[PDB]
Point group: D3
Chain length 146, copies 6
């Protein structure tokens, strides 16, 4: 049966996690982003904040996730014109008995969903691709790198 793994006996150590996500753009969507949106606000700006908010809401969205007080959240949402791609990166930090991989992953996922929300009016077919972990530190397994 499902369970929130017990980590009460484990010590409180410094944890960090970094993830990224991408939104593939059509020419119509790119044109829209280079102008500030399509009558609704700047998608990149709104998405960046949605990511930070999402990081804090992670334990509420992921069933078995441990609720943790976050000590740091950085989110970047930038347009890569030549690649016709929007790249989202998020780094979360804390001092706990469990990692913050889910917080970083969720921040990127929701920021990507927000980019989609504000560009779907012009392109409903936009795809969110490659939500993945890039790095993490802390824990017994130690440092991990993609």
């Amino acid at each position: 049966r499902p369970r929130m793994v017990d980590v009460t006996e484990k010590p409180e150590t410094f944890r960090t996690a970094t993830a990224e996500a991408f939104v593939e753009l059509t020419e119509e969507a790119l044109s829209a982003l280079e102008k500030g949106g399509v009558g609704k606000g700047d998608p990149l700006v709104v998405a960046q904040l949605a990511g930070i908010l999402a990081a804090k809401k992670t334990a509420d969205l992921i069933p078995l996730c441990h609720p943790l007080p976050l000590t740091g959240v950085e989110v970047r949402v930038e347009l890569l014109k030549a690649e016709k791609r929007v790249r989202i990166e998020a780094t979360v930090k804390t001092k706990a008995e469990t990692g913050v991989e889910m917080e970083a992953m969720t921040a990127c996922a929701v920021a990507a969903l927000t980019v989609y929300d504000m560009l779907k009016a012009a392109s409903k077919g936009l795809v969110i691709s490659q939500v993945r972990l890039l790095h993490k530190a802390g824990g017994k397994s130690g440092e991990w790198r993609r």
Copy 2:
């Protein structure tokens, strides 16, 4: 500036949206899923419910999204062994002045994040790929299909 588009004058019509997401599995992750998990519960079962819950929480996660009472939510999380892939599909329905594309997309995204959460212990490199809309009906633009 950002804004929740005014749709007060628009009529209350039947809306529907269907999206999907994929989690690419390593052999280690697949082996884990074919046994029910790695000491934490069945990832597919927990993820399916997380998707339904996420659909209802959509307006809270997406800044400019319209809060709507949902009349239907279906989520499926199945293992595709040969493809070493987990496929998530979600269909949301309602009667409103705006669509539920975000609810379907968010349900798939969070279900995928939950699959990742429960398999990351064995494979931190698992990737969430192709969160995308498959269909939607209702609205002026009418029926849309990928």
Copy 3:
């Protein structure tokens, strides 16, 4: 698999539901309630409000529950000295395609949990008993009475 039953085709009708719950008191707990609490506030007052708030949060707590805009919520938390019992009753109303039995039941459950929270300092053994539905109207099954 679990699913939020589709009721999009069903008409929007007037629904109502009434439930109740009881907290059995020890002499120590009763004595505390007859004085306004044990250094923390009036349990009956705080619990009554917790019930109203809980009714609105129902869809977030019950996985397959339909999110609905509530049009009415009444909660009563009264002390029955002779019976050494606290009786909670809640009636919820709305216009929807599904009932509000869960909203009434949840309001009573959380109000009871709040009574417990503020009296557990003196009596950790207090029991919440008989959370049950008393009545409901609306829907195909029509009127129901215990």
Copy 4:
């Protein structure tokens, strides 16, 4: 006792509400806002989005408030240099049996709190003043104007 007034019998009509709030700035705070902040982001931008989000969260914050699906939310956060004041205005709309005065008021209050949050590093004494309703339409009382 407190109660969420029953309005189930009332018809679903178009409602609107507009409110405003002000943040009085010190010279130190003004100087900070004219540069984009003090190492944390643009206070006006973050506050504007916080207001929209807050409007949707209103029923969760105000105990007896009726949960309603919002059909429109507009928030503006502008700097009034000469007056050394930040003015926040918010207009909310919906179709319901109750008004959205609380949604407009809460949107302004939280946007103001966010402006404070991002400028308190330089000026902890900043004051939020005059959160007040400016207009509302719909309901039996009809149109109201300050």
Copy 5:
């Protein structure tokens, strides 16, 4: 007046709490549970997860409850055929200045409410009985047992 008791000066110690709840079944409800439900999913499975989620949401539901990061949550929802009863048990753990009795109690209460939600279609009269604390450790009062 109500207040969240100040425990800032108290040390951060290991706390644990265990509670249980019961749902009394009619023959109709039992028959339904022995088949996996009545067209909506397995009540026992969905309820078990609802309990874990509820434990994390406890401070949001109980007014004066202290917000705490949980380090462990275990919930079990089993069918007791002979007794025509569903037994829910939940154990919560953490390191804090206050106990987690409310988290254990709330987890059981919401799991029970979820069992009711998915069986009320066949039996609206099902009763939730005996939500009660079984054990707790940590704190000045020390170990407690029912």
Copy 6:
């Protein structure tokens, strides 16, 4: 770009913050408060609890705010008849790497909004004035007093 300032390296120290807010009353509103309200419950009582709840929800409302476990929350909502004013004061405490000024400010703001909610039926023009910080301790800047 906006960011939740990293304070992971900072030590966990005792923090405190006190804020206040005022609601200016018309004679109609004052008369209503001296009787317990206008058919909806006691505004002062409901508002006081809304403030405590709001303090716990602060990080969810303020975008860049750090999520923290609160160890103490005190809120007072009193009527000042001669001044025709309702005064709200709130003191929040915790042990963290950041302050709780936002929690104190938000508690006062929401309590004030609740007072408004329950008196707006008789006076829609009521104004919330002077939400401001009165004191705070902890942090490098040390003790601060208005």
